[PDB]
Design a protein around this ligand. Structure first.
Ligand code: UNQ
Length: 271
Protein backbone atom coordinates (compact mmCIF):
# COMPACT_ATOMS: atom_id res chain seq x y z
CA UNK A 1 0.00 0.00 0.00
CA UNK A 2 2.74 2.37 1.09
CA UNK A 3 4.97 -0.79 1.03
CA UNK A 4 4.65 -1.28 -2.78
CA UNK A 5 4.81 0.85 -5.86
CA UNK A 6 2.32 -0.47 -8.51
CA UNK A 7 3.33 -0.64 -12.19
CA UNK A 8 1.49 -1.91 -15.29
CA UNK A 9 -1.23 -4.59 -15.29
CA UNK A 10 0.47 -7.82 -16.54
CA UNK A 11 -2.72 -9.93 -17.09
CA UNK A 12 -6.09 -10.96 -15.76
CA UNK A 13 -8.49 -13.91 -16.05
CA UNK A 14 -9.80 -16.87 -14.05
CA UNK A 15 -6.92 -16.26 -11.53
CA UNK A 16 -7.81 -12.50 -10.83
CA UNK A 17 -5.53 -9.58 -11.91
CA UNK A 18 -1.75 -9.39 -11.60
CA UNK A 19 0.39 -6.19 -11.72
CA UNK A 20 4.06 -5.49 -11.94
CA UNK A 21 5.35 -3.67 -8.80
CA UNK A 22 8.35 -2.79 -6.71
CA UNK A 23 8.93 -3.15 -3.04
CA UNK A 24 9.75 0.37 -1.92
CA UNK A 25 12.05 -0.68 0.98
CA UNK A 26 14.79 -2.29 -1.29
CA UNK A 27 13.41 -1.77 -4.85
CA UNK A 28 12.85 -5.56 -5.19
CA UNK A 29 10.74 -6.41 -8.30
CA UNK A 30 7.48 -8.02 -7.31
CA UNK A 31 4.19 -9.14 -8.90
CA UNK A 32 1.00 -8.13 -7.10
CA UNK A 33 -1.89 -10.55 -7.58
CA UNK A 34 -5.46 -9.68 -6.56
CA UNK A 35 -7.87 -12.50 -5.97
CA UNK A 36 -11.59 -11.70 -5.49
CA UNK A 37 -13.10 -13.36 -2.30
CA UNK A 38 -16.21 -14.42 -4.09
CA UNK A 39 -14.23 -16.33 -6.76
CA UNK A 40 -12.26 -18.34 -4.16
CA UNK A 41 -13.68 -21.91 -4.04
CA UNK A 42 -11.18 -23.39 -1.53
CA UNK A 43 -10.16 -21.99 1.76
CA UNK A 44 -7.66 -23.21 4.20
CA UNK A 45 -6.37 -21.95 7.40
CA UNK A 46 -3.03 -20.94 8.76
CA UNK A 47 -1.47 -22.58 11.84
CA UNK A 48 -3.18 -19.80 13.91
CA UNK A 49 -6.88 -19.64 12.80
CA UNK A 50 -6.81 -16.95 10.07
CA UNK A 51 -8.92 -18.13 7.13
CA UNK A 52 -7.03 -17.75 3.79
CA UNK A 53 -7.56 -18.90 0.20
CA UNK A 54 -6.11 -22.32 -0.23
CA UNK A 55 -3.72 -20.81 -2.80
CA UNK A 56 -1.94 -18.97 -0.02
CA UNK A 57 -1.66 -22.29 2.01
CA UNK A 58 -0.11 -24.05 -1.02
CA UNK A 59 2.25 -21.20 -1.84
CA UNK A 60 3.50 -21.14 1.79
CA UNK A 61 4.09 -24.87 1.65
CA UNK A 62 6.32 -24.62 -1.45
CA UNK A 63 8.00 -21.26 -0.59
CA UNK A 64 11.85 -21.51 -0.31
CA UNK A 65 15.13 -20.54 -2.11
CA UNK A 66 14.73 -23.42 -4.62
CA UNK A 67 14.03 -21.25 -7.52
CA UNK A 68 11.77 -23.47 -9.72
CA UNK A 69 8.45 -22.56 -8.05
CA UNK A 70 7.36 -18.94 -7.65
CA UNK A 71 7.93 -17.60 -4.13
CA UNK A 72 5.12 -15.88 -2.07
CA UNK A 73 6.72 -12.99 -0.25
CA UNK A 74 3.72 -11.55 1.65
CA UNK A 75 -0.06 -11.28 1.51
CA UNK A 76 -2.77 -8.91 2.64
CA UNK A 77 -6.52 -9.23 3.17
CA UNK A 78 -8.89 -6.49 2.01
CA UNK A 79 -12.66 -6.29 2.34
CA UNK A 80 -13.57 -8.13 -0.91
CA UNK A 81 -10.18 -9.60 -2.00
CA UNK A 82 -6.76 -10.95 -1.00
CA UNK A 83 -3.59 -9.46 -2.39
CA UNK A 84 -0.53 -11.73 -2.89
CA UNK A 85 2.97 -10.37 -3.28
CA UNK A 86 5.04 -12.71 -5.40
CA UNK A 87 8.60 -12.77 -6.61
CA UNK A 88 9.23 -11.24 -10.01
CA UNK A 89 12.25 -12.27 -12.13
CA UNK A 90 13.20 -9.73 -14.80
CA UNK A 91 13.31 -9.96 -17.76
CA UNK A 92 10.55 -12.65 -18.06
CA UNK A 93 8.50 -14.15 -20.86
CA UNK A 94 5.87 -16.86 -20.23
CA UNK A 95 6.42 -20.16 -22.03
CA UNK A 96 3.16 -19.81 -23.99
CA UNK A 97 4.35 -16.49 -25.60
CA UNK A 98 7.81 -17.89 -26.09
CA UNK A 99 6.35 -20.83 -28.11
CA UNK A 100 4.09 -18.34 -30.06
CA UNK A 101 7.28 -16.48 -31.06
CA UNK A 102 9.75 -19.30 -31.75
CA UNK A 103 7.30 -22.01 -32.88
CA UNK A 104 8.19 -25.69 -32.06
CA UNK A 105 11.35 -25.78 -29.84
CA UNK A 106 14.67 -27.53 -30.73
CA UNK A 107 14.71 -30.76 -28.66
CA UNK A 108 17.83 -29.65 -26.65
CA UNK A 109 15.85 -26.56 -25.53
CA UNK A 110 12.64 -28.56 -24.84
CA UNK A 111 14.78 -31.03 -22.80
CA UNK A 112 16.26 -28.27 -20.62
CA UNK A 113 12.83 -26.65 -20.03
CA UNK A 114 10.99 -29.94 -19.49
CA UNK A 115 13.68 -31.05 -16.99
CA UNK A 116 13.28 -27.86 -15.00
CA UNK A 117 9.49 -28.19 -14.93
CA UNK A 118 9.86 -31.84 -13.64
CA UNK A 119 12.20 -30.62 -10.84
CA UNK A 120 9.61 -27.89 -9.91
CA UNK A 121 6.70 -30.30 -9.91
CA UNK A 122 8.71 -32.82 -7.78
CA UNK A 123 9.37 -29.94 -5.33
CA UNK A 124 5.59 -29.23 -5.12
CA UNK A 125 4.74 -32.85 -4.45
CA UNK A 126 7.57 -33.14 -1.91
CA UNK A 127 6.02 -30.20 -0.10
CA UNK A 128 2.55 -31.95 -0.14
CA UNK A 129 1.09 -29.68 -2.97
CA UNK A 130 -0.58 -30.75 -6.22
CA UNK A 131 -0.55 -27.88 -8.77
CA UNK A 132 -3.36 -29.24 -11.11
CA UNK A 133 -2.76 -26.61 -13.79
CA UNK A 134 0.68 -27.39 -15.33
CA UNK A 135 0.67 -25.76 -18.80
CA UNK A 136 2.82 -23.31 -20.83
CA UNK A 137 0.69 -20.33 -19.66
CA UNK A 138 1.73 -21.10 -16.09
CA UNK A 139 5.51 -21.28 -16.61
CA UNK A 140 7.70 -18.12 -16.65
CA UNK A 141 11.17 -18.09 -18.25
CA UNK A 142 13.92 -15.88 -16.62
CA UNK A 143 15.58 -15.01 -19.95
CA UNK A 144 18.91 -14.00 -18.49
CA UNK A 145 19.43 -17.02 -16.28
CA UNK A 146 17.58 -19.68 -18.34
CA UNK A 147 15.54 -20.65 -15.18
CA UNK A 148 11.87 -21.57 -15.39
CA UNK A 149 9.36 -20.81 -12.57
CA UNK A 150 6.00 -22.56 -12.11
CA UNK A 151 3.29 -19.99 -11.23
CA UNK A 152 -0.51 -19.87 -10.40
CA UNK A 153 -1.45 -22.23 -7.63
CA UNK A 154 -5.04 -21.09 -7.85
CA UNK A 155 -6.38 -24.53 -9.08
CA UNK A 156 -4.14 -26.57 -6.79
CA UNK A 157 -4.83 -28.82 -3.79
CA UNK A 158 -3.10 -30.55 -0.94
CA UNK A 159 -1.58 -33.76 -2.38
CA UNK A 160 -3.33 -36.91 -1.19
CA UNK A 161 -3.18 -40.64 -2.18
CA UNK A 162 -6.91 -41.12 -2.72
CA UNK A 163 -9.13 -40.05 -5.60
CA UNK A 164 -9.94 -36.43 -6.56
CA UNK A 165 -13.49 -35.82 -7.81
CA UNK A 166 -13.33 -32.07 -8.38
CA UNK A 167 -11.16 -30.17 -10.91
CA UNK A 168 -10.97 -26.57 -12.07
CA UNK A 169 -7.68 -26.42 -14.00
CA UNK A 170 -7.39 -26.42 -17.85
CA UNK A 171 -9.53 -29.05 -19.58
CA UNK A 172 -7.26 -29.65 -22.67
CA UNK A 173 -4.47 -30.68 -20.20
CA UNK A 174 -6.82 -32.84 -18.09
CA UNK A 175 -6.62 -36.69 -18.39
CA UNK A 176 -9.16 -39.04 -19.98
CA UNK A 177 -10.27 -40.40 -16.59
CA UNK A 178 -11.35 -36.84 -15.60
CA UNK A 179 -13.18 -36.36 -18.90
CA UNK A 180 -14.99 -39.73 -18.68
CA UNK A 181 -15.48 -40.26 -14.94
CA UNK A 182 -14.80 -37.06 -13.08
CA UNK A 183 -12.12 -38.97 -11.07
CA UNK A 184 -8.33 -38.97 -11.12
CA UNK A 185 -5.36 -39.54 -8.86
CA UNK A 186 -2.98 -36.53 -8.51
CA UNK A 187 0.39 -37.90 -9.66
CA UNK A 188 -0.84 -39.73 -12.78
CA UNK A 189 -3.04 -36.69 -13.76
CA UNK A 190 0.10 -34.47 -13.32
CA UNK A 191 2.06 -36.88 -15.55
CA UNK A 192 -0.60 -36.70 -18.27
CA UNK A 193 -0.45 -32.89 -18.15
CA UNK A 194 3.40 -33.04 -18.49
CA UNK A 195 2.96 -35.19 -21.65
CA UNK A 196 0.67 -32.51 -23.07
CA UNK A 197 3.25 -29.86 -22.14
CA UNK A 198 6.16 -31.79 -23.71
CA UNK A 199 4.17 -32.25 -26.99
CA UNK A 200 3.39 -28.53 -26.88
CA UNK A 201 7.13 -27.69 -26.55
CA UNK A 202 8.31 -29.90 -29.40
CA UNK A 203 5.37 -29.48 -31.81
CA UNK A 204 4.47 -25.79 -31.02
CA UNK A 205 0.88 -26.53 -29.97
CA UNK A 206 -1.07 -28.95 -27.75
CA UNK A 207 -2.12 -32.35 -29.28
CA UNK A 208 -5.81 -32.37 -28.23
CA UNK A 209 -8.48 -29.71 -28.43
CA UNK A 210 -11.63 -31.85 -27.99
CA UNK A 211 -12.87 -34.35 -25.36
CA UNK A 212 -13.09 -37.02 -28.05
CA UNK A 213 -9.35 -36.73 -28.87
CA UNK A 214 -8.37 -36.84 -25.19
CA UNK A 215 -10.32 -39.99 -24.63
CA UNK A 216 -9.04 -41.80 -27.73
CA UNK A 217 -5.40 -40.75 -26.69
CA UNK A 218 -3.98 -41.31 -30.23
CA UNK A 219 -1.05 -38.82 -30.68
CA UNK A 220 -0.08 -37.67 -34.24
CA UNK A 221 3.19 -35.65 -34.60
CA UNK A 222 2.92 -32.63 -36.74
CA UNK A 223 6.66 -31.66 -36.60
CA UNK A 224 9.76 -33.79 -36.82
CA UNK A 225 10.35 -35.20 -33.38
CA UNK A 226 12.86 -37.93 -32.44
CA UNK A 227 11.66 -41.41 -31.67
CA UNK A 228 12.92 -41.20 -28.11
CA UNK A 229 11.01 -38.00 -27.48
CA UNK A 230 7.83 -39.44 -29.09
CA UNK A 231 8.21 -42.55 -26.89
CA UNK A 232 8.36 -40.40 -23.70
CA UNK A 233 5.34 -38.37 -24.73
CA UNK A 234 3.22 -41.40 -25.63
CA UNK A 235 4.21 -43.00 -22.26
CA UNK A 236 3.04 -39.89 -20.32
CA UNK A 237 -0.17 -39.98 -22.35
CA UNK A 238 -0.91 -43.67 -21.65
CA UNK A 239 -4.69 -44.07 -21.41
CA UNK A 240 -4.52 -46.20 -18.21
CA UNK A 241 -3.21 -44.09 -15.29
CA UNK A 242 -1.05 -46.86 -13.89
CA UNK A 243 0.66 -47.32 -17.26
CA UNK A 244 2.12 -43.66 -17.07
CA UNK A 245 5.68 -43.23 -15.84
CA UNK A 246 6.67 -41.99 -12.43
CA UNK A 247 8.73 -38.79 -12.20
CA UNK A 248 11.81 -40.98 -11.68
CA UNK A 249 11.00 -42.99 -14.81
CA UNK A 250 10.55 -39.72 -16.79
CA UNK A 251 13.85 -38.35 -15.60
CA UNK A 252 15.70 -41.65 -16.29
CA UNK A 253 14.24 -41.95 -19.77
CA UNK A 254 16.90 -41.89 -22.59
CA UNK A 255 15.46 -38.73 -24.04
CA UNK A 256 16.15 -36.82 -20.81
CA UNK A 257 19.97 -37.54 -20.55
CA UNK A 258 22.68 -34.85 -20.76
CA UNK A 259 20.44 -31.84 -20.03
CA UNK A 260 21.96 -28.36 -20.35
CA UNK A 261 22.36 -26.29 -17.14
CA UNK A 262 19.95 -23.29 -17.01
CA UNK A 263 22.82 -20.77 -17.65
CA UNK A 264 24.10 -22.68 -20.66
CA UNK A 265 20.49 -22.87 -21.90
CA UNK A 266 20.27 -19.07 -21.74
CA UNK A 267 23.69 -18.57 -23.47
CA UNK A 268 22.81 -21.00 -26.33
CA UNK A 269 19.13 -20.36 -26.87
CA UNK A 270 17.96 -17.23 -25.20
CA UNK A 271 20.70 -14.66 -25.48
N1 UNQ B 1 0.10 -14.32 -19.65
C1 UNQ B 1 1.26 -13.57 -19.29
C2 UNQ B 1 1.03 -12.03 -19.19
C3 UNQ B 1 2.35 -11.25 -18.89
C4 UNQ B 1 3.08 -11.81 -17.63
N2 UNQ B 1 4.43 -11.15 -17.49
C5 UNQ B 1 5.03 -11.16 -16.22
C6 UNQ B 1 6.18 -10.39 -15.94
N3 UNQ B 1 6.75 -10.41 -14.72
C7 UNQ B 1 6.17 -11.20 -13.76
C8 UNQ B 1 4.98 -11.93 -13.97
C9 UNQ B 1 4.50 -12.75 -12.84
C10 UNQ B 1 5.32 -13.10 -11.73
C11 UNQ B 1 4.90 -13.91 -10.68
C12 UNQ B 1 3.60 -14.45 -10.87
O1 UNQ B 1 2.92 -15.28 -10.01
C13 UNQ B 1 1.66 -15.42 -10.59
C14 UNQ B 1 0.69 -16.38 -9.94
O2 UNQ B 1 -0.46 -16.58 -10.36
O3 UNQ B 1 1.34 -17.13 -9.05
C15 UNQ B 1 1.47 -14.78 -11.77
C16 UNQ B 1 2.77 -14.09 -11.95
C17 UNQ B 1 3.18 -13.25 -12.94
N4 UNQ B 1 4.43 -11.94 -15.23
C18 UNQ B 1 3.30 -13.36 -17.81
C19 UNQ B 1 1.96 -14.07 -18.01
Amino acid sequence: ESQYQVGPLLGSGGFGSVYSGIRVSDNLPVAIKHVEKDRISDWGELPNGTRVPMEVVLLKKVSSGFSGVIRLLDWFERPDSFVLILERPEPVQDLFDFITERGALQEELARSFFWQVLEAVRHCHNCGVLHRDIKDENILIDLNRGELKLIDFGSGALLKDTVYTDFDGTRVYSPPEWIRYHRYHGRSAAVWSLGILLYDMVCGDIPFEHDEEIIRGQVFFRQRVSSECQHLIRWCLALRPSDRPTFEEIQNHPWMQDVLLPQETAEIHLH
